[model samples]
Target: KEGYLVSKSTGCKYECLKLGDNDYCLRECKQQYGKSSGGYCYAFACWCTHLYEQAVVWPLPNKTCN
Candidate 1:
């Protein structure tokens, strides 16, 4: 059952399965970064929205999710 997927914004990189359109990434963003955050799909990837000075944030391809 292979499908699209992505990870949370910060902290432990929890792989969140992507849904139709944008819910897949959007929900994950809110789940990890809280309601204040947002997300979108670009270049076949789910990019999470993060504000400046979020010390806990990190780049993709992390050990936890990947």
Candidate 2:
């Protein structure tokens, strides 16, 4: 019934594309969170969506994600 975003979250080792279609943005979501967690990549950014009632633990990074 609700959704949470975890873009550039903790443990994500990939970065979104800044000049073209992303290849790792969505992959980051599936890896760090889960296979079911959906994600999007665009505008030099990545976005993971936990489209469920129970959101995953998206650790607040100590450092800002580029």
Candidate 3:
């Protein structure tokens, strides 16, 4: 938990919402980093659960499901 690479991905560009936190996305950063700061709780959980992969979404993806 001291030093490690981190990453995250998003799918809001090709998914539909039907309930709470529909904005749900994905996160793959260092597991701990997410818990510390600059981590998206929902996305973090998704990453931790291995439901997503490492990706970029800073400037906001093209929303084209790249």
lDDT of 1 by residue, 1-66 (tens): 112233343434444455346687777556656677667654445556653343244444444344
Give me the candidate number with maximum TM-score: 1
- Alpha-carbon RMSD to native, per candidate: 7.7, 5.1, 9.7
Clashing pairs in 2: none
Task: Choose 2 or 3, whichever is better by lDDT.
Answer: 2
Error of 1 at 38 (Å): 0.7
Per-residue error at 19 for model 1, in Å?
A: 11
When sorted by TM-score, best at the front, the candidate numbers are 1, 2, 3
The C-alpha lDDT values of all candidates are 0.50, 0.52, 0.30
Give per-residue lDDT, candidate 3, residue 14: 33
Better of 1 and 2 by TM-score: 1
In model 2, where do residues sit more than 4 Å from their true spots? 1-15, 18-22, 56-66
